[PDB]
Write a protein that binds this ligand. Structure first.
Ligand SMILES: [Zn+2]
Ligand SMILES: [Zn+2]
Lengths: 348, 348
């Protein structure tokens, strides 16, 4: 195997929230992931981390104006609702003769398949940005698309016990008669399947492709569950109770929601009254439930310093700046004890 | 093509050099190259830049205790010295009376050839570091071999006029009876060929592969010149007159050195009786001469900010504090006006 190398950024500056529309909105603690394994990424996102390419970030739930909660669902036990069934029936009628292929494209410029459909994917992304979000065209260039949907620091390891496609980062493309109409970004992990971004052709806006893509990914995860027993979950990115655009993810039930402090999954029905009561609130059904993976031995952290893999306590003697030390300490609390000893904090 | 993206970070503290063994006379500037093209990297190295893997650094010539001047060979009119011919004849006798091959491999984990040979190359690097540089095994590892010799920020640009092997970072492996005895990390660029690093089997130090690998790289550059007229130069990294270890590169003639204050190539015959009196001097016979590629209009600097590629003028208008703008100005001056307009400063 290959170790995980990441770099931590304090990121003490506010950012404009894309949901609450505030200058001092989305606040998060960030890091620049150089190369991490899929298991490390899964363990991190189990703690609330979110991927935006090679840059990962954990939102500050205690300070963000619009708290974001990771929500997962169980494709094997999932039961579609009336709206989902109607959307599926409408799509099936549309896909009939009176046609569509789902393609998995790994995120790698060396892959000829990725380069063959790069132009179509970029055009679809531009159309989605200028139609749905109405963003200016100059803000939707090639660099914006690449740095946010094509820079995957996840190692594409393919263990024999895992799926035939393998872990890593992939794109689901919906080819309609040889033409791409919808592209979604999925991260395949041993435990779950994470979702980051999804876009589609605005012209087919009457089919509600945002729900059909989710149903297709649920079916794909359920099919993958036949091979891997540990792969029985599918993340829904983030959930905000004060944003109706993304609040429809709560309609997908049965589902589980990740607690902001205990890092455990609770039923969605139990936390919905808490979510509607206040924007941010610890669930904590019992006051004696602490995180199991919370960092308690920072010396176990592995650091790539002086061109050497050293324990945090061993390399601390060589290091001199104390403030950076604090930046490491919080980093540990944001990654857990297990990830601390498996990820290299590059400082050479 | 995709524009190069870099992130420059100024350094206000000195480092410890391996030549003068001083920790207060090795100041340098650096930038993380997330993704760069060869057309920009050749200009950068012509400006006096080198990369320690994915991190491109430029020494401060007027302040460093051990100046490092870039040296450029001329394979077009290169006449091997008597010592080099004697070494070639001696090693020919070794290979005849007691079957070396050269394999060129790109630098990327996706290549099966690179992945297959990653184990033997790692062991060879460990042996070279332990025996030659006296580096303990704690100061080496897979990450050390990866983040210093396997991190290639050069895009695989392969224009039809270029070499069939393409541009970018590459490894030349000297296979001997199926054994990896020497590896040289180099860069193939439209203007010249660089030499990132070199290591070899200590047990074969009797053959003195340090000069033979450089001779082979010169021959490879000359062979590349046959089809590519623009490619007519070859670099040997930095040349330190004080350090004997880096002095053996001066045995190759004809060759040129780069003036720190002029960025023009001047013959070594006109520079050898200059370093004997001092370590930092003007390597130009025209006092009334300045670099024609210096920073002229900083406002044309491309910045990838707020998911938008914008000129430096609007980016500066958006910002308010001018104190940190000096670092951007220093970066633009170091890379020059030509490189600034074709490079994106990732400081969003
Ligand atoms: Zn917000
Ligand atoms: Zn020095």
């Amino acid at each position: 195997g290959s170790p995980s190398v990441v770099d931590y950024f304090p990121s003490e500056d506010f950012y404009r929230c894309g949901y609450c529309k505030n200058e001092s909105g989305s606040r998060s603690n960030g890091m620049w992931a150089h190369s991490m394994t899929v298991q490390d990424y899964q363990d991190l996102i189990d703690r609330g981390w979110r991927r935006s390419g090679k840059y990962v970030y954990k939102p500050v739930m205690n300070q963000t104006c619009c708290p974001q909660y990771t929500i997962r669902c169980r494709p094997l036990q999932f039961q579609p609702s009336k709206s989902h069934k109607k959307v599926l029936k409408k799509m099936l009628k549309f896909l009939a003769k009176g046609k569509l292929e789902v393609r998995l494209v790994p995120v790698s410029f060396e892959d000829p398949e990725f380069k063959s459909s790069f132009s179509q994917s970029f055009s679809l992304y531009v159309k989605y940005q200028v139609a749905i979000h109405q963003d200016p065209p100059d803000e939707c260039g090639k660099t914006e698309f690449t740095r946010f949907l094509c820079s995957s620091p996840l190692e594409a390891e393919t263990p024999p016990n895992g799926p035939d496609c393998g872990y890593g980062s992939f794109h689901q493309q919906y080819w309609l008669d040889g033409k791409i109409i919808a592209v979604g970004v999925i991260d395949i992990l041993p435990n779950c399947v994470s979702s980051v971004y999804l876009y589609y052709d605005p012209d087919y806006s009457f089919l509600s492709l945002g729900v059909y893509s989710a149903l297709r990914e649920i079916a794909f995860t359920r099919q993958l569950h036949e091979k891997t027993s540990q792969l029985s979950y599918y993340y829904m990115g983030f959930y905000i109770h004060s944003c109706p655009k993304m609040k429809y993810k709560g309609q997908y039930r049965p589902s589980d929601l990740l607690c902001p402090e205990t890092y455990v999954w609770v039923p969605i029905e139990q936390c919905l009254p808490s979510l509607e009561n206040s924007k941010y609130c610890r669930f904590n059904q019992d006051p004696e439930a602490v995180d199991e993976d919370r960092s308690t031995e920072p010396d176990r952290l592995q650091v790539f310093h002086k061109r050497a893999i050293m324990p945090y306590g061993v390399y601390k003697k060589q290091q001199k700046d104390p403030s950076e030390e604090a930046a490491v300490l919080q980093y540990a609390s944001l990654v857990g004890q297990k990830c601390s000893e498996r990820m290299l904090l590059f400082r050479n």
